[PDB]
């Protein structure tokens, strides 16, 4: 006649089972990432040995950071930044690369710095500044239960499942990315590396496609 101990034990057991599932899935993710990376490296080496060139697949994911303030923005780029949820300077989002979104990045190029995020960048972004949109509220991702309660219907049970769905642009990338609240990054800790931010990265500025240097920039801003 206590109805407490046999329920706390059941809850601890269910928690242990969910943790074992997360552990197995994260080990599988580590194996997946390692295999894919080594396979790309070996493909490049094999093409070079065969006298060919391995043209890597075009990047499926970009990270976009709004580097311009909110004043004096023309209406079409303003609407595109709103639709990408970059409504504040140093707010960043993940974008799945298609023609439909590349034509958006083209329109907002002078106001954003974007590139191809690495696994390390995504991991640190989600771990430090990962917030979920739950009931229209910004809730920090401090526990895997939050992620399971809001994304479990898509098979995403943990923060590493979320990161996997982000880095590999999975079937539920749209849902996971939208669940992620736009990342509120700081200014870069070592500065922007250039005297003037608002020319293209190619022209010695900060905006546009900086494809792999987005990782350095975002790690400084994170």
């Amino acid at each position: 006649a206590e109805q407490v101990a046999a329920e706390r034990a059941a809850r601890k057991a269910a928690n242990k089972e969910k943790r074992a599932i997360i552990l197995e899935r994260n080990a599988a993710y580590q194996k997946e990432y390692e295999t894919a990376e080594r396979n790309i490296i070996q493909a490049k080496r094999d093409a070079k040995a065969a006298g060919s060139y391995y043209v890597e697949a075009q990047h499926k994911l970009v990270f976009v950071v709004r580097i311009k303030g909110i004043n004096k923005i023309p209406p079409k780029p303003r609407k595109v930044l709103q639709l990408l949820r970059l409504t504040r300077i140093n707010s960043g989002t993940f974008v799945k690369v298609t023609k439909a979104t590349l034509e958006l990045l083209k329109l907002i190029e002078p106001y954003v710095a974007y590139g191809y995020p690495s696994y390390s960048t995504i991991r640190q972004l989600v771990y430090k500044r990962g917030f979920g949109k739950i009931n229209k509220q910004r809730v920090p991702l401090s526990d895997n239960a939050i992620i399971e309660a809001n994304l479990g219907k898509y098979g995403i049970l943990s923060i590493d499942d979320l990161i996997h769905e982000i880095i590999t642009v999975g079937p539920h990338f749209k849902q996971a990315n939208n669940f992620l609240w736009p990342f509120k990054l700081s200014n870069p800790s070592g500065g922007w590396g250039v005297p003037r931010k608002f020319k293209h990265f190619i022209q010695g500025g900060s905006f546009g496609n900086r494809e792999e240097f987005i990782n350095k920039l975002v790690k400084s801003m994170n």
Binding site: I40, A43, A47, A50, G51, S52, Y53, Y54, V55, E56, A57, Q58, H59, K60, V97, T98, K99, A100, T101
Partner: peptide, 15 residues
């Protein structure tokens, strides 16, 4: 329908 996707990897021969 799906938008045009990023190209997959390919091996370009020099023969």
């Amino acid at each position: 329908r799906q938008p045009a996707q990023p190209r997959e990897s390919r091996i370009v021969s020099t023969e």
